[PDB]
CSV table of C-alpha atoms and ligand atoms in Angstrom, one decimal:
chain,number,residue,atom,x,y,z
A,6,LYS,CA,38.3,-7.1,-1.3
A,7,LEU,CA,38.2,-6.5,2.5
A,8,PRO,CA,39.3,-3.5,4.7
A,9,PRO,CA,43.0,-3.1,5.5
A,10,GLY,CA,44.4,-6.0,7.5
A,11,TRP,CA,41.3,-8.2,7.2
A,12,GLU,CA,41.4,-11.8,5.8
A,13,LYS,CA,39.1,-14.8,5.7
A,14,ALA,CA,39.8,-17.7,7.9
A,15,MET,CA,38.4,-21.1,8.8
A,16,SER,CA,37.0,-22.0,12.2
A,17,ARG,CA,38.4,-25.3,13.4
A,18,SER,CA,35.6,-25.9,15.9
A,19,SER,CA,32.7,-25.0,13.5
A,20,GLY,CA,34.0,-25.2,9.9
A,21,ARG,CA,32.4,-21.8,9.4
A,22,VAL,CA,34.4,-19.0,7.7
A,23,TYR,CA,35.3,-16.1,10.0
A,24,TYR,CA,37.3,-12.8,9.6
A,25,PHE,CA,40.7,-12.1,11.2
A,26,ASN,CA,42.7,-8.9,11.1
A,27,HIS,CA,46.4,-9.5,11.2
A,28,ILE,CA,47.1,-5.9,12.2
A,29,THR,CA,44.6,-5.5,15.1
A,30,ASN,CA,44.2,-9.2,16.0
A,31,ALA,CA,40.4,-8.8,15.9
A,32,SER,CA,38.3,-11.8,14.9
A,33,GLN,CA,34.6,-12.0,14.3
A,34,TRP,CA,32.1,-14.1,12.4
A,35,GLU,CA,30.6,-11.1,10.6
A,36,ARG,CA,32.1,-9.5,7.5
A,37,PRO,CA,33.8,-6.2,8.4
A,38,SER,CA,32.0,-2.9,7.6
A,39,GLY,CA,33.1,-0.9,4.5
A,51,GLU,CA,42.8,7.0,6.3
A,52,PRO,CA,42.6,9.8,8.9
A,53,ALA,CA,45.4,12.0,10.1
A,54,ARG,CA,44.4,11.4,13.7
A,55,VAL,CA,42.6,8.7,15.6
A,56,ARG,CA,41.5,8.7,19.2
A,57,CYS,CA,41.8,5.4,21.2
A,58,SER,CA,41.5,4.0,24.6
A,59,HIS,CA,43.3,1.0,25.7
A,60,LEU,CA,43.7,-1.6,28.5
A,61,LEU,CA,47.3,-2.6,29.1
A,62,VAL,CA,48.3,-5.7,31.0
A,63,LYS,CA,52.0,-5.6,31.7
A,64,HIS,CA,54.3,-8.5,32.4
A,65,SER,CA,57.9,-9.4,33.4
A,66,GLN,CA,59.4,-8.4,30.1
A,67,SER,CA,57.5,-5.1,29.9
A,68,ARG,CA,59.8,-2.2,29.2
A,69,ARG,CA,59.0,-1.0,32.7
A,70,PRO,CA,57.7,-3.9,34.8
A,71,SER,CA,55.8,-1.6,37.1
A,72,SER,CA,52.4,0.1,37.2
A,73,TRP,CA,50.0,1.9,39.6
A,74,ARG,CA,48.5,-1.4,40.3
A,75,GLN,CA,51.7,-3.3,41.2
A,76,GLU,CA,55.0,-1.9,42.3
A,77,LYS,CA,56.7,-5.0,40.9
A,78,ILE,CA,54.8,-6.7,38.1
A,79,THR,CA,55.8,-10.4,38.1
A,80,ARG,CA,53.4,-12.2,35.7
A,81,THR,CA,54.7,-13.8,32.5
A,82,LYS,CA,53.9,-12.8,28.9
A,83,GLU,CA,51.6,-15.9,28.8
A,84,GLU,CA,49.8,-15.0,32.0
A,85,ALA,CA,49.3,-11.5,30.8
A,86,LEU,CA,47.8,-12.7,27.5
A,87,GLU,CA,45.4,-15.0,29.3
A,88,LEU,CA,44.1,-12.0,31.3
A,89,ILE,CA,43.7,-10.0,28.1
A,90,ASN,CA,41.9,-13.0,26.6
A,91,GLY,CA,39.5,-13.0,29.6
A,92,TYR,CA,38.9,-9.3,29.4
A,93,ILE,CA,38.0,-9.6,25.7
A,94,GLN,CA,35.6,-12.5,26.5
A,95,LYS,CA,33.9,-10.4,29.1
A,96,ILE,CA,33.6,-7.3,26.8
A,97,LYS,CA,32.3,-9.4,23.9
A,98,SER,CA,29.8,-11.2,26.1
A,99,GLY,CA,28.5,-7.9,27.4
A,100,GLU,CA,29.4,-9.0,31.0
A,101,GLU,CA,31.7,-5.9,31.2
A,102,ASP,CA,32.4,-2.7,29.3
A,103,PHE,CA,35.9,-1.8,27.9
A,104,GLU,CA,36.3,1.4,29.9
A,105,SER,CA,35.1,-0.1,33.1
A,106,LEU,CA,37.8,-2.8,32.8
A,107,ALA,CA,40.4,-0.3,31.7
A,108,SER,CA,39.7,1.7,34.9
A,109,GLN,CA,40.0,-1.3,37.1
A,110,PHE,CA,42.8,-3.4,35.6
A,111,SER,CA,44.8,-1.4,33.0
A,112,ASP,CA,48.5,-1.3,34.0
A,113,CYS,CA,48.8,2.1,32.3
A,114,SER,CA,48.3,5.4,34.1
A,115,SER,CA,45.6,6.2,31.5
A,116,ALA,CA,43.5,3.7,33.5
A,117,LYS,CA,42.5,6.9,35.4
A,118,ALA,CA,40.8,8.3,32.3
A,119,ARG,CA,39.0,5.0,31.5
A,120,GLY,CA,42.0,4.1,29.3
A,121,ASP,CA,41.6,7.2,27.1
A,122,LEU,CA,44.9,8.3,25.4
A,123,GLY,CA,43.4,11.2,23.5
A,124,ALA,CA,44.0,11.8,19.8
A,125,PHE,CA,47.3,11.0,18.1
A,126,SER,CA,49.0,10.9,14.7
A,127,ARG,CA,51.2,8.3,13.1
A,128,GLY,CA,54.8,8.5,14.5
A,129,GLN,CA,53.8,9.0,18.1
A,130,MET,CA,53.0,5.6,19.6
A,131,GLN,CA,54.9,2.4,19.6
A,132,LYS,CA,54.2,1.1,16.2
A,133,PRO,CA,52.3,-2.2,16.7
A,134,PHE,CA,49.9,0.0,18.7
A,135,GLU,CA,49.9,2.7,16.1
A,136,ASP,CA,49.3,0.2,13.4
A,137,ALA,CA,46.4,-1.5,15.2
A,138,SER,CA,44.9,1.8,16.1
A,139,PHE,CA,44.8,3.1,12.6
A,140,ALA,CA,43.5,-0.1,11.2
A,141,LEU,CA,40.5,0.1,13.6
A,142,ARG,CA,37.4,1.8,12.6
A,143,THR,CA,35.6,4.0,15.1
A,144,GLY,CA,33.8,1.8,17.5
A,145,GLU,CA,35.9,-1.3,16.8
A,146,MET,CA,38.1,-3.2,19.3
A,147,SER,CA,41.4,-5.0,18.7
A,148,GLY,CA,42.5,-8.3,20.0
A,149,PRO,CA,45.7,-8.6,21.9
A,150,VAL,CA,48.3,-6.1,20.6
A,151,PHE,CA,51.9,-6.7,21.7
A,152,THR,CA,54.3,-3.8,22.3
A,153,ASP,CA,57.3,-3.3,24.5
A,154,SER,CA,54.9,-2.0,27.3
A,155,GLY,CA,53.0,-5.3,27.4
A,156,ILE,CA,49.7,-6.5,25.9
A,157,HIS,CA,47.0,-4.1,24.9
A,158,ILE,CA,43.3,-4.2,24.0
A,159,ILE,CA,42.6,-1.1,21.9
A,160,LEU,CA,39.2,0.7,21.4
A,161,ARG,CA,39.0,3.3,18.8
A,162,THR,CA,36.7,6.1,19.9
A,163,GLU,CA,37.2,8.8,17.2
B,201,LIG,C1,32.7,-2.1,25.4
B,201,LIG,C2,32.9,-1.1,24.3
B,201,LIG,O1,32.8,0.1,24.5
B,201,LIG,C3,33.4,-1.6,23.0
B,201,LIG,C4,34.2,-2.7,22.7
B,201,LIG,C5,34.3,-2.7,21.3
B,201,LIG,N1,33.5,-1.7,20.9
B,201,LIG,N2,32.9,-1.0,21.9
């Protein structure tokens, strides 16, 4: 019926159907459009206290909670989706990953290289598409597939 990971859902606040992807955590009102050996993605990472390494170039000791990190991710998504900000601008300013310095770009990668929730989300994204919050042992990610 729908592209990999995508399902129909029901809006509580509007009663209108929407689309949810249980691999990427994306959600949108519009029906999704229409697998490669490699994808290329950028990401914005927000780390927290349970991160595999609770440290980043932004913060020597990262002390926020999983919940606080998810709310930040939720605010970044709202700003990207509203057009108030662009993904790679926010990655450069606020990503807790060292790829912040390359506007969140991680380069191309195959299956078997990244942490799997990330790998799965990345490969279920089409070029140009963004994920919702993706949880890994590094923290919470927003993922943009670029190639
Ligand atoms: C802001 C940006 O480049 C984006 C986010 C989803 N797709 N493109």
